[PDB]
Amino acid sequence: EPWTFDYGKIIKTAKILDISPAVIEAIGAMEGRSYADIREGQGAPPPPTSMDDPRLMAVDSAVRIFLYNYNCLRHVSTFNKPPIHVERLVKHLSYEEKEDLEKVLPNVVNEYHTTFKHLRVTDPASALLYSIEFLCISFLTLYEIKEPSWVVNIVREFALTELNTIIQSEKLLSKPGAFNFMIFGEDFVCSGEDSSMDDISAYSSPGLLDDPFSIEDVDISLDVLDNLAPQ
């Protein structure tokens, strides 16, 4: 099967969330940038060329937390108690239909992991687009569902909440704006480029009951130690 990148899925997905397409395309590349620049798409890094680019892991991590949280809702019955991000909206449900939602909700993890590991080794540039596109098509799959009637309102809310948290988690790694520095609870506030408050003992080489060679129970004057010479 020949895979081809589809830009139409990102445009459709971005329109639903009322956000710029550049925000979706910049998953994992938001570090060290202003979100206003990310929103406008200015300063976007070039496509990856190395299989060890942390962007590939960053996008893949965002994909698997969508899948991890989706399956938690899918298997809500098996839990002793559901986690926070899925319990407040399924609370009004009954047990027999809470034991359901694993038959009426389709699986969306069909062939992601196998293909991503192949694309990462073969061509890293296509792997980043594949992981982003997979996140959008999975969101559209969970947003374009229509039957049965009792599940549409419980999954579309989930789809928007998950994709928003993924974007927000990526957003919280960008360049911060302006804020009160004293809300942390202390006077001083250092940065990652500061050396004033570094540990003094850390400048030395890091790292390190009876002494067998110590004359501690031998009462001999320190000025007459030549009596211990081997001779």
Partner 1 sequence: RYAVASYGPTDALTGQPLDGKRSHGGLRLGEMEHWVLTAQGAMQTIIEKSHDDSDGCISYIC
Partner 2 sequence: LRPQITYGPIETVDNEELTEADMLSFISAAVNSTGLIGYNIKSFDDLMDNGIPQIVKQMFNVDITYKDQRDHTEIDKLRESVQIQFNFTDVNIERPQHRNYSQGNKINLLPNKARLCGLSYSGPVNLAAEVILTAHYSNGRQEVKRASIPPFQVSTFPIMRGSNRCHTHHLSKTAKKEIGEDPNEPGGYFIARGGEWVVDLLENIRFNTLHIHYHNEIIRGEFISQPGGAFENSSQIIIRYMTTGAITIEINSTKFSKLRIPWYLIFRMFGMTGDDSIIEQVVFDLESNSLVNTFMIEILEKSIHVLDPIFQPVQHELNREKIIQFLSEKVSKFVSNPSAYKSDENAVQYLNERQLTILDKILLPHMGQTADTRVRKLRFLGLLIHKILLVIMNVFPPTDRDSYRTKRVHGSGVSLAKAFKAIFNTSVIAPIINGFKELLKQTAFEELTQRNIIEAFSAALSKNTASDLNRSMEQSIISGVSTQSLERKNLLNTISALRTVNTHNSKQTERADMMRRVHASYPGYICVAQSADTGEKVGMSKQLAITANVCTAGEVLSLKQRLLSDPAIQQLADVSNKDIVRKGLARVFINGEWIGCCTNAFELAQRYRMLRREGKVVHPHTTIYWDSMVDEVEFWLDVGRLTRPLLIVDNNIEKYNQACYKAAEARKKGDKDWEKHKIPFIQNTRFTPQMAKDILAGTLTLEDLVAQGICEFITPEEAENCLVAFSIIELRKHKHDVTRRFTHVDVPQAILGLAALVSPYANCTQPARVTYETNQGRQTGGWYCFSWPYRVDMNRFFQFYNEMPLVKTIAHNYVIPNGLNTIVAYMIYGGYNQEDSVIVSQS
Partner 3 sequence: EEINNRLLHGDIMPPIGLTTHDFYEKLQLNALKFPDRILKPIMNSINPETNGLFQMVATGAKGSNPNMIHIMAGIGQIEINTQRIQPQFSFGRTLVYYPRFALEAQAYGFICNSYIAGLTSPEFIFGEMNGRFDLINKALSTSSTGYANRKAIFGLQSCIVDYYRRVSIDTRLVQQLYGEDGLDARQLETVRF
**What residues make contact with partner 1 under the rule CB under 8 A?**
218-221, 223
What CA–CA distance (Å, rounded) separates 7 from 27? 15
> Is 209 a binder of partner 3 (CB under 8 A)?
no
Asked whether the beta carbons of 30 and 38 are under 8 A apart, the reply is: yes
Binding to partner 2 (CB under 8 A) within 87-126 occurs at 113, 121
What CA–CA distance (Å, rounded) separates 30 from 166? 12
The residue from 111, 147, 210, 219 that contacts partner 2 (CB under 8 A) is: 210
Q: Toward Mg ion, which CB reaches closer, 114 or 231?
A: 231
CA nearest neighbour of 166 among 145, 122, 136: 136
> Is 212 a binder of partner 3 (CB under 8 A)?
yes
> Is 216 a binder of partner 3 (CB under 8 A)?
yes
Residue 100 DSSP code: -
Stretch that binds partner 3, among 20-28, 91-99, 179-187, 206-214 (CB under 8 A): 206-214
Judged by beta carbon distances under 5 to 8 A according to partner kind, the member of partner 3, Mg ion, partner 1, none in contact with residue 230 is partner 3
Q: Toward Mg ion, which CB reaches closer, 193 or 226?
A: 226
The answer for residues whose C-beta is within 8 angstroms of residue 66's C-beta and 6 or more apart is 135, 138, 139, 162, 163, 166
Asked whether the beta carbons of 130 and 119 are under 8 A apart, the reply is: yes
Binding to partner 3 (CB under 8 A) within 35-54 occurs at none
Judged by beta carbon distances under 5 to 8 A according to partner kind, the member of Mg ion, partner 1, partner 2, none in contact with residue 212 is partner 2
Q: Which residues bind Mg ion (CB under 5 A)?
A: 229, 231
